[PDB]
Write an enzyme that holds these catalytic residues in place. Structure first.
Site, short mmCIF file in Angstrom:
data_model
loop_
_atom_site.label_atom_id
_atom_site.label_comp_id
_atom_site.label_asym_id
_atom_site.label_seq_id
_atom_site.Cartn_x
_atom_site.Cartn_y
_atom_site.Cartn_z
N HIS A 130 0.79 -1.17 -0.10
CA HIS A 130 -0.09 0.11 0.07
C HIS A 130 0.89 1.17 0.07
O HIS A 130 0.24 2.29 -0.58
CB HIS A 130 -1.02 0.00 1.29
CG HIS A 130 -1.99 -0.85 1.11
ND1 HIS A 130 -2.69 -1.39 0.14
CD2 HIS A 130 -2.43 -2.08 2.33
CE1 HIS A 130 -3.70 -2.21 0.52
NE2 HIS A 130 -3.44 -2.67 1.73
N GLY A 138 -2.34 2.03 5.03
CA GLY A 138 -2.73 0.47 5.11
C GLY A 138 -1.61 -0.12 5.97
O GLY A 138 -1.40 -1.20 5.41
N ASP A 165 -3.37 -11.00 -2.49
CA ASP A 165 -4.04 -10.43 -1.08
C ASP A 165 -5.51 -10.09 -1.53
O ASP A 165 -5.80 -9.75 -2.39
CB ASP A 165 -3.12 -9.23 -0.94
CG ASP A 165 -3.07 -8.84 0.36
OD1 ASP A 165 -2.46 -8.90 1.37
OD2 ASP A 165 -4.35 -8.28 0.94
N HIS A 167 -6.63 -7.53 -0.45
CA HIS A 167 -6.77 -6.03 -0.67
C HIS A 167 -6.00 -5.66 -2.03
O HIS A 167 -5.36 -6.42 -2.45
CB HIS A 167 -6.26 -5.31 0.43
CG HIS A 167 -6.93 -5.36 1.79
ND1 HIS A 167 -6.40 -6.45 2.60
CD2 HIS A 167 -7.84 -4.71 2.14
CE1 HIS A 167 -7.32 -6.42 3.76
NE2 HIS A 167 -8.19 -5.42 3.50
N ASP A 254 -4.80 -13.03 3.76
CA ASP A 254 -6.15 -12.55 4.39
C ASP A 254 -7.37 -13.12 3.60
O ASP A 254 -8.36 -12.66 3.96
CB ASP A 254 -6.11 -11.11 4.70
CG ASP A 254 -5.43 -10.22 3.50
OD1 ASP A 254 -5.24 -10.73 2.44
OD2 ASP A 254 -5.21 -9.26 4.02
C1 B3N Z 1 -10.12 -4.88 14.91
N1 B3N Z 1 -9.89 -3.47 14.23
C2 B3N Z 1 -9.63 -2.55 15.44
C3 B3N Z 1 -9.67 -3.39 12.96
C4 B3N Z 1 -9.55 -4.35 12.31
C5 B3N Z 1 -9.26 -4.28 10.72
C6 B3N Z 1 -9.29 -2.68 10.29
C7 B3N Z 1 -9.18 -2.55 8.85
O1 B3N Z 1 -9.29 -3.19 8.18
N2 B3N Z 1 -8.65 -1.26 8.47
C8 B3N Z 1 -8.46 -0.47 7.18
C9 B3N Z 1 -6.94 -0.69 6.80
C10 B3N Z 1 -6.78 -2.06 6.25
C11 B3N Z 1 -5.51 -2.25 6.09
C12 B3N Z 1 -5.39 -3.66 5.34
C13 B3N Z 1 -3.77 -4.02 5.35
C14 B3N Z 1 -3.56 -5.40 4.40
O2 B3N Z 1 -3.95 -6.56 4.61
N3 B3N Z 1 -3.33 -5.13 3.23
O3 B3N Z 1 -3.04 -5.91 2.01
C15 B3N Z 1 -9.53 -1.70 11.25
C16 B3N Z 1 -9.64 -1.93 12.52
K K Z 2 -4.82 -8.45 -4.27
ZN ZN Z 3 -4.69 -7.69 2.87
#
Ligand code: B3N
Ligand code: K
Ligand code: ZN
Ligand code: K
Length: 364
Positions: A130, A138, A165, A167, A254
């Protein structure tokens, strides 16, 4: 020859001090080690990335600010919000050395590929897709995937980035969106309000890079068979149209059933078929991790995929090791899909594939 495995005890310890995946790196390596897969790989210690290597993508102002706030872990600095530091990416103490270690490990793997040491190089602590040239995003402070691709560009004229991924790999796509030397392909959940919100099938890149970005938006609940059908269809056309000389593959876990993201419904076997399909191209291949927030299932996934890379079939029982108690209630390597619906309408998926097929006709 033998696949390269980027590893040292100090690297795993450094990775383990990460606010978002505590002890994940140790669990992954220790399961790989408990299956004895490290004996079948060439272990290479990571070098940490120099400032000049990080500046092949990131701006000097961003890097210097990251370095400053990383000193005491000052997360009240006035310029931090302008560099995306704060909510998802706090300016914690040592974050710059941690980001440089991971970036340097991905660069080390790419350097192994250039030097012909191997044809597959693995960094299961990379994949931070990201980050932008001047902004954290992110949970990503540096974009090691971009850094790895830019290292591979010292030798390879056309690089294919594949991002599996959950995302959208927006940082990598943004880095290369004006160029045709690097094609980016992302399969990801795409839904109004789902992070990072970009990556519709209509996003195909810009300027001279128009049609050199491929985005496959997917809905909740997809399983192994349909996911592989989509992925093989896209990569078959991409390989014909683009003819890559090297591949960077981001394999964030994920997507796997049991992840708290609770979005896709995949098992490592399905991701493994996508990986096998890329591996038979016999190109230099850089393997990266990514997301994955059910720690035992993440170790399960990347261990199984390490076995795929080695062509080894693994025992179903999780072997006795430091983290054995984490693999309950079943203590086996295989993951069971959750009982919930697949929201992907076959006609929407086929329309998406038809669009990509048309976009790829323009590809040289
Ligand atoms: C339990 N808790 C407090 C949270 C759990 C998940 C997020 C989230 O998805 N936030 C948005 C940013 C997502 C970043 C994803 C990283 C990733 O896996 N990228 O490929 C927020 C709070
Ligand atoms: K992806
Ligand atoms: Zn991800
Ligand atoms: K591109």
């Amino acid at each position: 020859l033998v696949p390269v495995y980027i590893y040292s005890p100090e690297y795993v310890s450094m990775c383990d001090s990460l606010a978002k995946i505590p002890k994940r790196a140790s669990m992954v390596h220790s399961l790989i080690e408990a299956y004895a897969l490290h004996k079948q790989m060439r272990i290479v210690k990571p070098k940490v990335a120099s400032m000049e290597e990080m500046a092949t993508f990131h701006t000097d102002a961003y890097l210097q600010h990251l370095q400053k706030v990383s000193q005491e872990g000052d997360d009240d600095h006035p310029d931090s919000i302008e560099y995306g530091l704060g909510y998802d990416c706090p300016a914690t103490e040592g974050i710059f050395d941690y980001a440089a270690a991971i970036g340097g490990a991905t660069i080390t793997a790419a350097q192994c590929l250039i030097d012909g040491m191997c044809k597959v190089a693995i960094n299961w602590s990379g994949g931070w897709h990201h980050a932008k040239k001047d902004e954290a995003s992110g949970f990503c402070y540096l974009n090691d995937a971009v850094l790895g691709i830019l290292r591979l560009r010292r030798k390879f004229e056309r690089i294919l980035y594949v991002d599996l991924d959950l995302h959208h790999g927006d940082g990598v796509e943004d880095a290369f969106s004006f160029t045709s030397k690097v094609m980016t392909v992302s399969l990801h959940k795409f839904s109004p309000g789902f992070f990072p919100g970009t990556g519709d099938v209509s996003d195909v890149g810009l300027g001279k890079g128009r049609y050199y970005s491929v985005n496959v938006p997917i809905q909740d609940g997809i399983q192994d068979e349909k996911y592989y059908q989509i992925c093989e269809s896209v990569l078959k056309e991409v390989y014909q149209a683009f003819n890559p000389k090297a591949v960077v593959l981001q394999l964030g876990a994920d997507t796997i059933a049991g992840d708290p993201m609770c979005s896709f419904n995949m098992t490592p076997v399905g991701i493994g078929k996508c990986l096998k399909y890329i591996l038979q191209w016999q190109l230099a291949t850089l393997i990266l991790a990514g997301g994955g927030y059910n720690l035992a299932n993440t170790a399960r996934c990347w261990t199984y995929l390490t076995g795929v890379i080695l062509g080894k079939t693994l025992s179903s029982e999780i072997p006795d090791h430091e983290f054995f108690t984490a693999y309950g209630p079943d203590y086996v390597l295989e993951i069971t899909p959750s009982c919930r619906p697949d929201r992907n309408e076959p006609h929407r998926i086929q329309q998406i594939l038809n669009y990509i097929k048309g976009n790829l006709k323009h590809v040289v």
